[PDB]
Amino acid sequence: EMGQGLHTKMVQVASRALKIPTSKIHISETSTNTVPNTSPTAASASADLNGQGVYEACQTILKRLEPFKKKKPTGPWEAWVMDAYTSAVSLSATGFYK
Amino acid sequence: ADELVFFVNGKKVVEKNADPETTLLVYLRRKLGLCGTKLGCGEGGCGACTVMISKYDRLQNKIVHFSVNACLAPICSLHHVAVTTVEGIGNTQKLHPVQERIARSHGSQCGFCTPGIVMSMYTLLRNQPEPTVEEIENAFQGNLCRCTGYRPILQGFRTFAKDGPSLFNPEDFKPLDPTQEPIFPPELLRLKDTPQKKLRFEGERVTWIQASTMEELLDLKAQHPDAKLVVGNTEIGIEMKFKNMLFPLIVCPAWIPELNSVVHGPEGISFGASCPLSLVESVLAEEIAKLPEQKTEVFRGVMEQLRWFAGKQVKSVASIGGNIITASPISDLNPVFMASGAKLTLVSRGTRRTVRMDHTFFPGYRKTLLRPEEILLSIEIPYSKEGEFFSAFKQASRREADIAKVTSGMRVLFKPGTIEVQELSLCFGGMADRTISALKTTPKQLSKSWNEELLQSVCAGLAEELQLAPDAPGGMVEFRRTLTLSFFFKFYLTVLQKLGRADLEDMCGKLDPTFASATLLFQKDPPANVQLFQEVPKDQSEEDMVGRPLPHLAANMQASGEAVYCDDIPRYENELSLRLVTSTRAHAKITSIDTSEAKKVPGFVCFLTAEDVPNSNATGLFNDETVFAKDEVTCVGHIIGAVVADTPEHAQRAARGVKITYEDLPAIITIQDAINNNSFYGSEIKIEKGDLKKGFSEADNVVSGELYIGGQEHFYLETNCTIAVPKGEAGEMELFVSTQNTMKTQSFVAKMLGVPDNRIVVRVKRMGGGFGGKETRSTVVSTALALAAHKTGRPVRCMLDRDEDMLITGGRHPFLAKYKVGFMKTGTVVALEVAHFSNGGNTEDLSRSIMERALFHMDNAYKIPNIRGTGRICKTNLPSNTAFRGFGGPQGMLIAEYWMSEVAITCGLPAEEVRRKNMYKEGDLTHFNQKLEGFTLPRCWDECIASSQYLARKREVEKFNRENCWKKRGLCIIPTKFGISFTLPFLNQGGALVHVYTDGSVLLTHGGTEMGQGLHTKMVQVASRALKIPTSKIHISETSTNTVPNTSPTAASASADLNGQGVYEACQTILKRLEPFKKKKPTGPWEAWVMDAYTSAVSLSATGFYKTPNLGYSFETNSGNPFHYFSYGVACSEVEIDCLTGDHKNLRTDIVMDVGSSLNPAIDIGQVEGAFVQGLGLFTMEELHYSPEGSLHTRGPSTYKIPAFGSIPIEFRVSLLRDCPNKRAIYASKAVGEPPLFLASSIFFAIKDAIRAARAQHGDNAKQLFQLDSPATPEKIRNACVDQFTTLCVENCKSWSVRI
Amino acid sequence: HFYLETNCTIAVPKGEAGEMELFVSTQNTMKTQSFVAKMLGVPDNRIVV
Amino acid sequence: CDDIPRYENELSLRLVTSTRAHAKITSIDTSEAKKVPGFVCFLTAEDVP
Ligand SMILES: Cc1cc2nc3c(=O)[nH]c(=O)nc-3n(C[C@H](O)[C@H](O)[C@H](O)COP(=O)(O)OP(=O)(O)OC[C@H]3O[C@@H](n4cnc5c(N)ncnc54)[C@H](O)[C@@H]3O)c2cc1C
């Protein structure tokens, strides 16, 4: 983030992808020890590239929660998450795009 | 003047404003940034702060070197010396030989004790470049290690000794070149010529005068008698730090020649009162070596007490006068000086008197007959005369560096050529509020002959004269009284021997040879150790390190002091300090809080209370704990608030100015109190199988009894610590914490603040030990510090002092068990009912899971067809007890072995045969219906019983016992089965995250935390095998909630299993992505494949995850598997008890342990040894005492005695079972951390056998199935050895402590 | 460019294994990491930007 | 970045740059720099590990 509102856009993207409010999603920083081998934030393309990455990471989380959404199609997000945790389903994912 | 000038690692320090209250430890760490030197205790017991001092000694005219505790050394005592710390001797770029050898020999696990042990060894070598094995052991009397079990440290360092597949290769160690040590600072040699002048230092509260001459000291003491002398500071530093005493004027007379001289006279040797005990030791040793025996009886008595007096670091600065004037009731020296009539010279300006120490020298508690203006100049320790004999005795909880329960000097003088007593003096510490002489008893024996009538007369006299009130400070009244008589008996027998050697054998009689062993001075054979493990296959790559003995990855940095623990992280310029304020009542209303005095302390910021919590004051695993007490306190140690100030010193002073007013409420302390009040955490827990009424009806025999097991303090050498760094945006905060549980730390902070988990990051690089004590209880510090940081917007830090940590954070659960066992004459067990109670303290925490694990292990190794176990967790007004390595298993299994011991005795059958024939077999179901597959316990048993030569040794024990009346041996072999996996199924999960950067280097992280168990090492081993690259290309930096979320605690021995699988899977994901590139360049290196993947836009980051499958037990249906697999092992241990004192030697221990196909046999053997030694502590040495009002008495290493270098089995053999792959865990390994601990019960049951032999010997009465509670301490052992002495020493009623 | 914030780096050494954390005003964490690691002669895995 | 609090032990760095477009460096004299209070060191190419 250099003032272009990239984190803003990525939170907008993640909120749509996950179908949860932006308020539930936070970006703190950019670090080489969370995402390696990154291109510079350059060439106007950083929302295009990272937005796709974010979208794919979110799709992976959604695929993992699918059975729990099936069992409780109304129960809130928080119930699906906690059910996944207590079922020992991973709640971390990477995402990538080229 | 007033500038303080010294050197640190060769660099000149000029301190223009030295505060007398500043210790060298705090100066090194906080002023100079040298954090290799650690705080472990602040009271001289642990040696973590050990450093070397060099100076030019003007009195001996040469450069000298000695070790000190930096935690107790005032900087103001150090003008014109040269300090060497761990950083001064070497670093990872060029390690000193001492650093190299401890690292490469697997002598460093958590690494917190390593710098101090390094400096103890380094100082020895600077003094003695070719030490003996014995000298090496003695170098560490002042150093504690909680992780390693000491064996590897001594084995590594034995390579320096002149008389000294494998785990390490000593042939690859680089040789020592003494010419390459640091120069003695040339400036100090130049300054040696300048006369010493008096110095004055002024601090915030204290003025220090370094007196140069006797005239200056005497003048000062006449004008200002309140001026407090400080020499070694080993008493005054304690008084100031822990008893909050403030002496605003101190005078240090250490430089004065008259107080430092040694004069040989016709009557004896005169020591200046400031002479260190190290100098007393060296002088008396020389004199004992060259003078006739007849003249050195008193010298040898002093030497015997000095042998068990602290360690090298204390003795180098502790003064002979300091001990005398402190006048502690438990001085080990004063009884000897009193008994020998040592001559003291006292001086004041214009006065001089000499007195013989006698009863009158010590009027009342910690008083002497010195006038306030007087100082002690010298003490003359006398030559013994013809016909004069002397013994000194001490019995404590642990031999080495411990407070006497009773201590004594005894002197007899015979009329020449007779066995008739001319003079008799029996003097004792630990029997009154002062050193006492048995002045009513000894006059009666003058002119009697040395014979049985004199022995009986003196014993009856002592029993009547040395009475103790039931409420005597320190308790153990029966034990202490028994020891006075027992010591006198030893002296009586010794004097018979001494008379014999003077040719009066015909007058006094010879000693029955079965009595001789009673008089022997303590000695241990030199150690002998064996480690056996399995070589990896011949075809295994040299770069595949799985199964190889790779040293802990941080060992070199731990040895060099470069490894960073939480409090070693530099402070921010704006960082504040926090101190917790805790309840001094077990159960009370808080009526009011007055912070008026706190607010006056300079640098005070605020006092946080419940009102300051932004969101929720409800915390703890089961949400039944306060962040800060609200309206009432529910234990002594309950956190009421926290002071925030600029410095730790100011925070301490401000916390003392927080005045709390209470109104007491009915307290529930003990398990019995809880039972009476129906005060429990939840319902009874139960496992039952078969038909109990039927089994008892069919039994030939039925035995009932109870057993009590004391709890245990973790004594991680690094206490609880948190740094909280607020980020000023969106509630973001980062915390650096010594914790096993990053997830609960983050959750609890976020809940207290009322912010989402996504705002809070918790980072752990390493812990200096955890052992379960940092699974949950770390969070009580973390939440307080996080609030402080939120409120101020500044970084805030808190590291607990040892006393705080021991009070607040709880321990292993005490257990009371009531058992009934039915069995056949053959020893076969057919029925068992056991009711278990634990003392949980004032929050639920992990207490119910701990009880479940105890119930899952109430079988230990044994098939029992009709079985009923219950457990209840008591809710009490005590600090909350928590996880400790074993997690209820050791308590459950000790109860099983205890009734098993009584089964064998009742049947009159060999205990090993009874255990063997009750053991499960392959395919059996447990009492909870889990099938035992890959059941290796019978192999472990057969291997151990053969390799230990148990049967031939049984023969030798029986022979020893028939030939010795007052020492007995015991020998026991004990098995174990330990279920692996958290009892809560979903905690059996783990995650990893791996990155490959474009240079080919790999950054790995996983949910597990490093606490000294070598988890990161193992994970690197695993990753290197999985990726087929060398370990050198893979790095783990830390554990973080923002790289792997939702992690289970590093607990249940399971972390390598869980994280190893997650690492493996992350690695397989990377390899799958690199496959097409590997296929195109099957030869071209790893780096080419990586760069090809990158420039093809292939992701080089992956998560990995694992969950243990098929777990989930139901208590309702007694079905489903709680455990993934079981650990197995066997230990055979041998002991020799002293029936007259309750001391014992651990002669030999042999362990065979099933660790599957070990991931790392060096680390695994280290886990076996370390776990075993913690169990040795649990069952034999470690004991917490509590007032009847629920106040923990036992708050530091002075009183809480963990195993020392000298405590371990003399012969210590460990074998890892061969050819036993466990394919359901990572690379066919098994978990190792907790299962070995219970095997130290072999020492407990060897002790029990030896007591049984003692009770057969003496006592006219016996009583089979005698009680031995845990821990089997010297008190419990001695009291069980009933004899003519215990008989003479034998409600309701206030006492010093209560059984909780 | 006249970015209102000029170029700025804080480098925090960790004293172990060549590890170093850098707080940087940069658009290029990867090249920052690479260039630091190469100058120091340590692997990329030691350097966090 | 610069708003982050300094550590108590944090040091400050300042680059020394060329005042010539193209030149050999004949010599460098740091005698006056060494006299400034709080001076620690002057890093050059020879310091690169
Ligand atoms: C780890 C540890 C283990 C210990 N083990 C033992 C043990 O096994 N047995 C035992 O008996 N003690 C033990 N001690 C107690 C302590 O080490 C000794 O009492 C020590 O001898 C005190 O000497 P010092 O020079 O450090 O005294 P300081 O603390 O400097 O002074 C002690 C007291 O003596 C006064 N004083 C000192 N010199 C004079 C003088 N010349 N004239 C008048 N007053 C004077 C001081 O004013 C002060 O009141 C232990 C202490 C520690 C820390």
Ligand SMILES: NC(=O)C1=CN([C@@H]2O[C@H](COP(=O)(O)OP(=O)(O)OC[C@H]3O[C@@H](n4cnc5c(N)ncnc54)[C@H](O)[C@@H]3O)[C@@H](O)[C@H]2O)C=CC1
């Ligand atoms: N740190 C260590 O490892 C060691 C320290 N020391 C000494 O231990 C001391 C401990 O100091 P404190 O805890 O204040 O203990 P203290 O000096 O009050 O002595 C406590 C002991 O004194 C006896 N005692 C006191 N009053 C009594 C009474 N009325 N009746 C019967 N017995 C009584 C008991 O033996 C009791 O356990 C230190 O000052 C030091 O001199 C000695 C050995 C080891």
Ligand SMILES: O=c1[nH]c(=O)c2[nH]c(=O)[nH]c2[nH]1
């Ligand atoms: O095609 C581009 N490549 C870059 O590296 C770059 N950097 C930038 O600022 N804009 C562009 N565009």
Ligand SMILES: O=c1[nH]c(=O)c2[nH]c(=O)[nH]c2[nH]1
């Ligand atoms: O079954 C266990 N659960 C835990 O939470 C734990 N903690 C520990 O130290 N050992 C164990 N065992």
Ligand code: FES
């Ligand atoms: S910290 Fe100094 S001896 Fe423990």
Ligand code: FES
């Ligand atoms: S390695 Fe010794 S206390 Fe941890």
